Design a protein around this ligand. Sequence first.
Ligand SMILES: Nc1nc2c(ncn2[C@@H]2O[C@H](COP(=O)(O)OP(=O)(O)O)[C@@H](O)[C@H]2O)c(=O)[nH]1
Ligand SMILES: O=C(O)CNC(=O)C(=O)O
Ligand SMILES: [Mg+2]
Ligand SMILES: [Mn+2]
Lengths: 380, 201
Amino acid sequence: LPHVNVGTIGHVDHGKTTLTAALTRVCSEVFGSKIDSAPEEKARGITINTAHVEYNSTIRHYAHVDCPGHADYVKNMITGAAQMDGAILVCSAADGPMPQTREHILLSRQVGVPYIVVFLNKADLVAELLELVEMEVRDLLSTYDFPGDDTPIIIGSARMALEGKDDNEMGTTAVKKLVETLDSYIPEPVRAIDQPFLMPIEDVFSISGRGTVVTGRIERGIVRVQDPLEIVGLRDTTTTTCTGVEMFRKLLDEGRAGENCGVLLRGTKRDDVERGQVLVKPGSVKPHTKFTAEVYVLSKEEGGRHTPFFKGYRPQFYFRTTDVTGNCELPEGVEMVMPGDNIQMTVTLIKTIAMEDGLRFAIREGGRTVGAGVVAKIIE
Amino acid sequence: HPMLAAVVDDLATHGWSQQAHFLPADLVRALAAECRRRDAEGELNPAGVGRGATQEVRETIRGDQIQWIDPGQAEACDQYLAAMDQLRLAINQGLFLGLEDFECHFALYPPGAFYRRHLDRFRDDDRRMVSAVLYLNEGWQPHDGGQLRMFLADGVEHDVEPVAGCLVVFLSGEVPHEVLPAGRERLSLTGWFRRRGNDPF
Ligand SMILES: Nc1nc2c(ncn2[C@@H]2O[C@H](COP(=O)(O)OP(=O)(O)O)[C@@H](O)[C@H]2O)c(=O)[nH]1
Ligand SMILES: O=C(O)CNC(=O)C(=O)O
Ligand SMILES: [Mg+2]
Ligand SMILES: [Mn+2]
């Protein structure tokens, strides 16, 4: 049973929270289906108001994210607390597309959500607008570069399905149909360990007699002895070979995603590598400096700034394991930015950093986090 | 200095270490004094359990009273933090664990309070790697109870009396442990070193 991350997005009152309970029941009826004692932690940080449910189809296992408030959607989507492999946009025939519908489709594009599936809710209340409403939404999606013309759209009423109480084909059948669509349209996602090697570098040592070592926690993929590698970031890209992996004073033949270890390089001098760089499968990731980014500015209450900011904000951008200063470029008409607000900006970094579309980063003004962002489009 | 090499060796071979008199008695009394000074001002509060939205004070599991420590509150603590950071770096250089930072708080168990069997690492957040506890109690004795009890490999149990100066370090993801009731006040400085997660925030 593969693990697919999914979630509902759309306007308010349109029935996201309802299609959520509906999905659990239709699956539980038609598809099979303890407290943590650890000591509390110091901070807490952002407060994500997020609900989670689980439900299984025949083919796969789903983890589902629903959110109370629009603001909650914005925080959760930008941070990755709610990262979806495919999202279920809920729109109603009754009311049609509304502001938070546009904002969420857009927001999904920025944050890198791969695929979007639509469920036209409240079908019970209808006729003839279903043709017209599909037309609109399809172009609405296409406006933001999702396959709006070739996108699946299921029509039904979740409240029936939940009570289901299938009256037309619009009840239980349509939710079965939605699940069937997830099974089909959203491809099985690629596990971290099946991705190209990557490890952000923390410390750099030289153990007497065995060469130079860089440590960190492997983000994705696997590194094996005698694998070629590039060191990418803050400096001109360099090549090297892995000559060993160490962990708890034991010698391993390979390091794996999730593992904290030390990697031994061939030849590379201790001064030819530093914190912030990433150890990478060659040509897998490139150095970059200018990008567009969706950002959420933390509230006063969340440890963020007590006051807004303006053009020429040059804060610190934290990418994996190090800081780098960046210039911020806001859209036209935008003068101020309020703590707790979210906006798009074009950032230009003083140094080059290893990045890809969809990389999360933190923004810091003097050590403490004051914003959280995600890379939207690489420019230079 | 050589005492750090010991902890690093111990963690490597056994996954835990205890060292007597890890700090000098003079600094240990001042840490105990800072703990008391805080209690006297109502600055310690019931400690809770769990993370995020499900963090709750459940007094049938954990009953100590706490307050987190930061730099600049008291030189005794600044000294502690400095010792701990020397440890953090030793452990990084010798075991490559990738410890980035350190949470710690003063902890006071009133008599009768306890902490039932648990792992320090959260069920759904794996950032905690090394646990460290420093005790601050003078003239402790076996009749006072209040020992940390550790569940080691192969069914082996080990008790540690909470004696001034004593430091206990273990792998947070791997050594279940509990604190038994005591007949008198029990002061300590508990913390966790932790490694990178999946996000900065
Ligand atoms: N008649 C009907 N009402 C619905 C349907 N879906 C949602 N609603 C109504 O909208 C109310 C609140 O919707 P909710 O699921 O909380 O919307 P959300 O804010 O997007 O989560 C529900 O209790 C229903 O009264 C539906 O399919 N048919
Ligand atoms: O107080 C002790 O001896 C042990 N401390 C803990 O278990 C803790 O705070 O997580
Ligand atoms: Mg809702
Ligand atoms: Mn504990």
